[PDB]
Design an enzyme around this catalytic site. Structure first.
Site, PDB file in Angstrom:
ATOM      1  N   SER B 364       0.752  -1.242  -0.123  1.00 32.01           N
ATOM      2  CA  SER B 364      -0.027  -0.038  -0.092  1.00 32.01           C
ATOM      3  C   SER B 364       0.932   1.158   0.081  1.00 32.01           C
ATOM      4  CB  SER B 364      -0.982   0.058   1.272  1.00 32.01           C
ATOM      5  OG  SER B 364      -2.027   0.872   0.848  1.00 32.01           O
ATOM      6  N   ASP B 484      -7.915  -6.100  -5.633  1.00 31.54           N
ATOM      7  CA  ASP B 484      -7.799  -4.874  -4.983  1.00 31.54           C
ATOM      8  C   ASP B 484      -8.350  -3.808  -5.619  1.00 31.54           C
ATOM      9  OD1 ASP B 484      -6.749  -2.877  -3.421  1.00 31.54           O
ATOM     10  OD2 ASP B 484      -4.765  -3.762  -3.582  1.00 31.54           O
ATOM     11  N   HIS B 515      -6.968  -5.853  -1.115  1.00 38.07           N
ATOM     12  CA  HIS B 515      -5.909  -5.103  -0.795  1.00 38.07           C
ATOM     13  C   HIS B 515      -5.326  -6.208   0.632  1.00 38.07           C
ATOM     14  CE1 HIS B 515      -3.594  -1.420  -0.636  1.00 38.07           C
ATOM     15  NE2 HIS B 515      -4.077  -1.108   0.514  1.00 38.07           N
TER      16      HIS B 515
END
Ligand SMILES: [Ca+2]
Ligand SMILES: [Ca+2]
Lengths: 794, 794
Positions: B364, B484, B515
């Site tokens: 991320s 994601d 994610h």
């Protein structure tokens, strides 16, 4: 805002405060010659345990604030001789892990603390008051749920004492002064008096010991023993659960299976010798409380007992042999029974590290076996903390003559649970020998559990610990979730009624969870209470544990951070109320219905056709979904105009007639209204945010919070077999279309219906998630003129 | 049955096998003089690392089985000179954590292994083959996901080497021969060249270092650096997310905000001196991979950089200053930039424990900053493992001229994410100073992000790392979840197209998660691959890492344990197909629709009235719920008669007219059919069932499994602003009721539609979970004769 309620803080006078602060190297030995600034700076810097030199601690002081316009460093530089209340707690709240603006305002730190139930000292105008404010602060629950002293411990504050090989107490509680890098995790083999696998030899059971290395230096420690049938491994067998989609059968087929004990082969005796263990543990603690206490000097002992991995024998679910094999571990810990280093039985090893005082820990099967072992009065067992526990095995798979599942465990029974914990099958070398013995026990359990009739029996009676409650000699803590529909709350209620009468000290904790722990909540310092408790009961330290907190603590179902303090849990907390159905589907204290209303139960036909889940069915059912509520009679009160708290066990009387010469009736009490009730389980607030010690693992702070709106909640319910209308212990034949009087009790509760909600009595039969689901229809007729629901309210 | 696929096993010849086995004290130095029985017993007993004496190991042998009628102990007693294949693996499978009967049959152990993709040796007829079978076994993935050698490591096998202060390799990988009880977790303060808080001083950033104690004995180690803006704490601000329930506005109001860099204040230079750190770390590793590698000699370094706790500065989301402050930590690690023991800047400390080779880790924001730092070519950065990463910040909050949220992050933007990581505000002493600087940056970010027009700008261009891809000098691993919808897959696709062209070595991993990580799955030994990778790239060991596994590994969406090996991820994997809508709501390669079909978008009016969740809306929408599908045009193919794999980025052309002089069009591709698709996230199979080292924490084995049936799944989608019909970088005015040609790309995918399913093209406008939700209606008309969807398939 949430109230971090604290019940474990022991009032301490200033001389004892000073003594403890000096003893933990927090306050200087000659504190009286220190001026105010020098004291305040040292005490704040000592709390900042992550900075290791004085220079590093000093630089940290700039990062704290006494006001919206002055850092702590600049405050100290002004040569202060006192500190205002708001100034001190603008520092303190940051030590407690709260953040300015986002949590509290510079202008009102003690206002904030007041609304999270955090204590604060109003007056800090000299060295004495400042020391007492810092003593209370160290004992103040921080945002992560732990008192500040435990946050310091997580930062290694107490490693300076490692190597001193002794317990150290603070506010009556054991603190982490043990070298957890050197903790000993070993394995021995205790010899039981049983031969449950019919090999002519005593069953040995693998036993896992976690003890402080300090025991190698002569320190004797207490032991917290966990009897866990799961400890060796868990065999999944859900696909083997017995079919519940079957019609009811005639319970008079009952022929009263009998309990017969396993062969006895008495174990050898201990002879004095001991050699150290030769095996390291591979299984882990299953409850963070134990590891927390292990960092604080209490050994934890874990054993699966017979039938589990590295052990002889077979599981015999709920039987005396499960009690005896589990109690054998305490006898070894007290030095009365032998153990070996391996299964050749050649070398004896002892629990000579143990000071002879044992308490028990753990939930579910683990808390069940604590009740069982307690009734034997085994020497050494000083106290139990029995969590989410079965107190009578009939009450886990049966009720009132009927076969009643735990939630999400339809078709589970003694034989399934036996295999589940039969983990010595995982040792393929032992499988050769154990597999035939396991098969024989499967046949005996399947037959004797008598799923055909649902009846009690001499066999079931062998698993009723409550009938030996007179044997209990230990002090007693019970923990149970009010919404546990797995191990249903009847279990703890009925053992509590016996235990509360006894001379030893006793407490009860009821939380809003289901089959779930409460050691890590915002709203109650349970871990700290158990620390104080275990120190009093197992170290014999007079730390006020017997006077510290109320007998019964009951978490509120409307406000998760309200805990009710009660002297008991019984109908005696409230006053008797009776509601009667009406012919219009209502429920009133002056109700006077007179019709005979009927409903046609369609077994599991419609449920299994619709393919919906059991929990989906339950919610739609109690909400009154037309499709699922049709097989039932519903009676609603009017909206409540003041909140009312139902307490104890509601009792239903109901006159009923059935279309077949057999049947069952279920009765539920439901709270009606669309509102945000509490989450089913606590919401995670600080994942791994609690330190069990220094580099010794974590726990998660959590608490129940308002959930998405629901339209209803089940308060309590119960089931009953028609053929037991005369006797709970003896079935009778019944004629179809003849009325019988059923009188029975519902599950115990402590539930505040809020004003604006309704109370619904539901009468039905097939519970898609907990009864058998018949393949045929059956019509029930209820005489409203002889039906009522009675409960106590507060 | 699940395939525990293994890609990290390096072919090793017998001489090298013997060398490694001797080196880890598993095989005797003079193995050639040992007879078969003595060898087999020693090698099995050495695997049984939990028994610590030879007596304890011997007693354990009875617990294993070679057949359904003979334990291993009894087999050995027969003085065997060889062992049959089924006999060996009846022992091996138990060492691998499998259980007989419940997992495999005594009769067919290698059949079982074959179906879980476990290797086995067909022939074990002498000491040589038995040693090679045991070498492969040690390198065999066990049931808990880890190779057997790591299970031994969890049992402490490699503590015998602790204190030897050196790396040790097995099958090309670093193994845990470091004293993790003594691991060093310290804190320093690196000095950047920035003054983002306008105080005239270089911003210092708190840096957390985890390094093996062995570095105190002269061993230099590599460092795995994690640039985590969250590391100092995460400020919740979801209630401050900008309102998205607003009408679209005229994008020609765009005036092209410009990027302006922060003041520079160059840091002092390192001078040679160093004193050890004076602060212990309080934040934890956020990725179990790092701790796993730390037990194996690789230091891990974590820093939030500017704006975070114990650091100066402000967050400036996606800006160059976030790259520069994060890169400053590598410069310190390579010995080019200064650091101090505390924020007084008085005492210098160095990373002289580091061998000068740095790799990066994390997902991320953490994987985003690896792309950013890589483009600077910073000296010392040898490789990145960039996970779930943004490669251009416009692509995280915008698309094709429109404001497009991450999933469940409606109204989030640069200014929200800046505050989220502005954790030095938690230091109330620094709050006094930082709060005004944070406010100024909030005003600048809110203005320059230009949510009014949705357009690109010079300002956004400053956060486009892909335009500096020429700066990358390090080798490259990207990891991304194909589902994601937070950091959308376009990010990794577009950086991959540039990186794949470059001379350095590069790999890509695409998993079925959103994610979410993939380091602990059944179906792929990612952790072991990274071990091999980090050893090659950071220790310079020639262990075949550059030849070991395929460039691109893509997890299959129909079978979770099928991983596609591909040379690329691009349209070039398949062949071009075009589908055209019909006037009857169909979608065919020979479609020929000619009508103008209209739909009336009702913004967020109906969505917000119904009170349903954004994910509820999305599922009901793609399923075609009448109430929610009305604002759209749907075109279905016929059922597929063979599975087809869509690859790359589908491209939609669509001629559209709008009722207002503004608007947006969304286009989605959906797979239709009721079937059990994979779970949204991996199902937990062995909770904490993986050991990171010896007493060094755990990870959870997990894998995607068939879920409850769903009727549809989103494959890909994209959005576009009407006023960008001419230029993605420049808006234009548009007339209502005039047709414009939109041509744009959808999110990249790799998706097998199974036979029997349909493919649906959906044309709509307001996406309740990702676009603005207007308060007015707007009607769109699509010319079917100039609309098409083109994608590549395999
Ligand atoms: Ca026996
Ligand atoms: Ca500055």
């Amino acid at each position: 805002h949430m109230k971090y309620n604290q019940y474990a803080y022991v009032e301490t006078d200033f001389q004892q405060q000073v003594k403890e602060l000096i003893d933990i190297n927090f306050l200087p030995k000659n504190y009286q010659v220190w001026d105010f600034g020098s004291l305040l700076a040292k005490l704040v810097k000592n709390a900042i345990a992550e900075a290791k030199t004085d220079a590093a601690k000093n630089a940290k002081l700039a990062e704290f604030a006494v006001s919206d316009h002055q850092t702590l460093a600049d405050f100290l530089k002004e040569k202060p001789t006192e500190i205002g209340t708001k100034q001190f707690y603008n520092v303190a709240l940051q030590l407690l892990g709260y953040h300015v603006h986002y949590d509290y305002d510079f202008a009102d730190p003690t206002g904030f603390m007041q609304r999270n139930a955090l204590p604060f000292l109003q007056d800090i105008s000299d060295n004495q008051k400042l020391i007492s404010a810092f003593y209370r602060l160290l004992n103040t629950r921080a945002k992560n749920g732990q008192i500040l002293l435990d946050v310091m411990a997580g930062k290694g504050y107490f490693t300076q004492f490692w190597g001193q090989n002794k317990f150290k107490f603070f506010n009556g509680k054991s603190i982490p002064v043990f070298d957890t890098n050197k903790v000993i995790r070993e394995v021995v083999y205790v010899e039981t008096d049983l031969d449950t696998d019919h090999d002519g030899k005593s069953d040995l059971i693998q036993v896992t010991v976690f003890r402080p290395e300090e025991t190698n230096k002569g320190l004797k420690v207490p032991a917290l023993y966990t009897a866990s049938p799961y400890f060796g491994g868990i065999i999944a067998n859900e696909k083997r659960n017995h079919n519940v989609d079957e019609n009811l059968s005639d319970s008079t087929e009952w022929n009263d299976p009998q309990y017969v004990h396993s062969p006895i082969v008495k174990a050898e005796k201990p002879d004095g010798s001991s050699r150290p263990a030769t095996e390291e543990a591979v299984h882990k603690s299953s409850y963070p409380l134990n590891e927390y206490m292990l960092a604080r000097g209490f050994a934890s002992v874990f054993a699966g007992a017979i039938g589990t991995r590295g052990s002889d024998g077979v599981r015999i679910t709920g039987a005396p042999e499960e009690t005896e094999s589990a109690a054998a571990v305490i006898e070894w810990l007290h030095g009365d029974r032998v153990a070996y280093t391996d299964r050749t039985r050649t070398v004896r090893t002892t629990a000579d590290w143990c000071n002879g005082n044992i308490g028990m820990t753990g939930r579910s099967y683990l808390g069940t076996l604590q009740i069982a072992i307690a009734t034997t009065g085994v020497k050494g067992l000083k106290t139990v903390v029995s969590e989410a526990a079965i107190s009578s095995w009939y009450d886990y798979y049966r009720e009132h003559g009927s076969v009643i599942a735990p939630e999400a465990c339809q078709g589970e029974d003694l034989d399934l649970l036996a295999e589940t914990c039969q983990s010595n099958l995982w040792d393929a070398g032992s499988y050769l020998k154990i597999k035939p013995e396991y098969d024989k026990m499967q046949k005996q359990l399947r037959e004797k559990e008598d799923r055909n009739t649902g009846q009690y029996s001499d066999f079931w009676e062998a698993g009723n610990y409550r009938h030996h409650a007179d044997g209990i000699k230990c002090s007693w803590i019970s923990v149970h979730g009010l919404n546990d529909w797995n191990v249903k709350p009847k279990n703890v209620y009925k053992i509590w009624q016996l235990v509360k009468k006894m001379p030893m000290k006793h407490h009860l904790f009821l939380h809003q969870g289901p089959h779930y722990n409460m050691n890590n909540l915002v709203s109650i310092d349970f871990t700290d209470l158990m620390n104080l408790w275990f120190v009093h009961e197992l170290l014999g330290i007079e730390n006020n544990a017997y006077n510290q907190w109320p007998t019964v603590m009951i978490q509120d179902n409307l406000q998760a951070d309200k805990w009710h303090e009660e002297p008991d849990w019984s109908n005696d907390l409230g006053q008797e109320k009776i509601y009667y159905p009406t012919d219009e589907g209502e429920l009133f204290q002056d109700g006077n219905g007179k019709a005979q209303k009927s409903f046609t139960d369609v077994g599991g036909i419609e449920f299994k056709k619709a393919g919906i889940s059991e929990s989906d069915w339950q919610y739609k059912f109690i909400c009154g979904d037309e499709k699922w509520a049709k097989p039932s009679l519903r009676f609603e009160t009017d909206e409540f105009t003041h909140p009312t708290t139902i307490v104890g066990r509601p009792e239903v009387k109901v006159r009923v007639s059935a279309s077949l010469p057999k049947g069952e009736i279920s009765v539920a009490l439901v709270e009606l209204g669309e509102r945000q009730r509490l989450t089913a389980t606590p919401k995670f607030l600080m994942h791994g945010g609690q330190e069990l010690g220094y580099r010794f693992g974590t726990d998660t702070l959590q608490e129940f919070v308002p959930d998405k709106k629901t339209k209803a909640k089940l308060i309590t319910k119960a089931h009953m077999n028609l053929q037991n209308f005369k006797d709970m212990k003896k079935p009778e034949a019944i004629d179809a279309d003849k009325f019988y009087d059923l009188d029975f009790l519902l599950q115990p509760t402590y539930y505040t219906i809020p004003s604006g909600s309704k109370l619904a009595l539901i009468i039905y039969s097939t519970d898609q998630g907990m009864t058998k689901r018949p393949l045929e229809d059956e019509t029930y007729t209820i005489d409203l003129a002889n039906t009522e629901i009675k409960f106590y309210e507060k």
